Amino acid sequence: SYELKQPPSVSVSPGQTARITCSGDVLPKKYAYWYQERSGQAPVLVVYEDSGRPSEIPERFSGSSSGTKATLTISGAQVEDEADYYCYSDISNGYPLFGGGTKLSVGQPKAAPSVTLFPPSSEELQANKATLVCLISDFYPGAVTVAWKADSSPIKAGVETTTPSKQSNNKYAASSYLSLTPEQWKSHRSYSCQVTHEGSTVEKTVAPT
Amino acid sequence: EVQLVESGGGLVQPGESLKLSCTASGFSLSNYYMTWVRQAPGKGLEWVTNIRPDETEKFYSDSVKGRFTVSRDNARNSLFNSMSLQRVEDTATYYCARVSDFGDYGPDFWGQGTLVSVTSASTKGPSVFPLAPCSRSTSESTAALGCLVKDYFPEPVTVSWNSGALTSGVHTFPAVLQSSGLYSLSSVVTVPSSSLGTKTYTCNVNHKPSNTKVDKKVEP
Numbered sequence A: 001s002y003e004l005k006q007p008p009s010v011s012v013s014p015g016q017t018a019r020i021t022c023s024g025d026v027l028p029k030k031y032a033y034w035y036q037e038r039s040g041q042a043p044v045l046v047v048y049e050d051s052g053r054p055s056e057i058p059e060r061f062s063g064s065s066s067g068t069k070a071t072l073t074i075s076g077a078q079v080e081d082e083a084d085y086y087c088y089s090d091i092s093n094g095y096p097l098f099g100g101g102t103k104l105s106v107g108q109p110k111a112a113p114s115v116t117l118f119p120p121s122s123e124e125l126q127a128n129k130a131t132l133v134c135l136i137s138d139f140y141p142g143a144v145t146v147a148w149k150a151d152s153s154p155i156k157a158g159v160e161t162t163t164p165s166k167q168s169n170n171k172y173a174a175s176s177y178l179s180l181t182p183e184q185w186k187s188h189r190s191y192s193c194q195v196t197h198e199g200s201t202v203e204k205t206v207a208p209t
Numbered sequence B: 001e002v003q004l005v006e007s008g009g010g011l012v013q014p015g016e017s018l019k020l021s022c023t024a025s026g027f028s029l030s031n032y033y034m035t036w037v038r039q040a041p042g043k044g045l046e047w048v049t050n051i052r053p054d055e056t057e058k059f060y061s062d063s064v065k066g067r068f069t070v071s072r073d074n075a076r077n078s079l080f081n082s083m084s085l086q087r088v089e090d091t092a093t094y095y096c097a098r099v100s101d102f103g104d105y106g107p108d109f110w111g112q113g114t115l116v117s118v119t120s121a122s123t124k125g126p127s128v129f130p131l132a133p134c135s136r137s138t139s140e141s142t143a144a145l146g147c148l149v150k151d152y153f154p155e156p157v158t159v160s161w162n163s164g165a166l167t168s169g170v171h172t173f174p175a176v177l178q179s180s181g182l183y184s185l186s187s188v189v190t191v192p193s194s195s196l197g198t199k200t201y202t203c204n205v206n207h208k209p210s211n212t213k214v215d216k217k218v219e220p
Ligand SMILES: Cc1cc2nc3c(=O)[nH]c(=O)nc-3n(C[C@H](O)[C@H](O)[C@H](O)CO)c2cc1C
Pocket: A093, A094, A095, A096, B033, B034, B050, B051, B057, B059, B099, B105
């Protein structure tokens, strides 16, 4: 399989330039595209064949590329430029791809997330189920990354994270849940919920006790 | 000018079938290549298929190859995506787009999409489990206590504390839509661990859709 390795999140101040990358093993042989998708809205083309640019896309959106990294550079960041950006290209035998996508935010005072981790209640355990809850509160801009760790080892099977939500205080709220079996919860000796936001990483851990 | 309109998306159960349709206007469908790209709520864009204008070639993502089949009717400016043997993971919003004609094949114009939900979720009530730390976070000046409102359906759920008395420190998080088409959400109320063993903390979960009301008193 193959990946358009694309940074999950990116934020910039109104008026300054923003740069989104997109690594890839076959990008040196295949073109790269960029799409802009505003919340609950069809994606829109902003860049094609690495540098092309549609006649509806303002010049400040500059596509470029080289080797194995395409880069969507958005200058003079606007409040309207806040949305998700995805790169496109394909494998070494034509099948199309998409990057993980990237979140582009603008302005208000930046804030770090309040992370709280809860272990499985002995009660839910009696129900032959285990569920670790990771609440992420008061962060800004509204974009975070949640990775779960089984004793320092990663894991993906059993994770359900929410989409950043706007609290009443104009900051954001997120929640992530790792579902295990009563046996796994006791199997390992520690589970950890690490929430990285703006390069910053908060990592709370819990262990059977 | 260029315009794409999806439809057919709806709510169905695993294994069941569904046939989406995309009708275009503003251009000759027969002059372009078409694709369907889907996106599960809060997730990235995932490519599904591409279909040659003369329909002599059809490409599908491994995830859907065999179950989904693309088809067109350049005469009726229509693209079609018949999905069969539905899986939960196929749940997402289906976008049909016009495939550009330069560089490799990215699309240029996307329709707004049609939502495709797929579950057996009926109307479960929420289970409510206590949310308290082990021994580390219990030794703070103000830890957090909460209620885990697990597996319910459909939204919404109302959480409160001490029948509405307690309000400060309360933070009811947005529900997470677990794989099994069932919602879950937590609600924590941050309070001092000093006067913790003297006061009562009781969330009152309300789920009218299920006609359920639970009151769990969390202790330290
Ligand atoms: C997975 C896959 C997707 C393709 N998608 C397109 C497309 O959208 N548009 C296009 O002109 N050619 C596409 N092609 C190339 C096309 O099949 C064909 O080889 C050329 O037009 C040669 O006739 C694709 C090839 C593959 C393997």
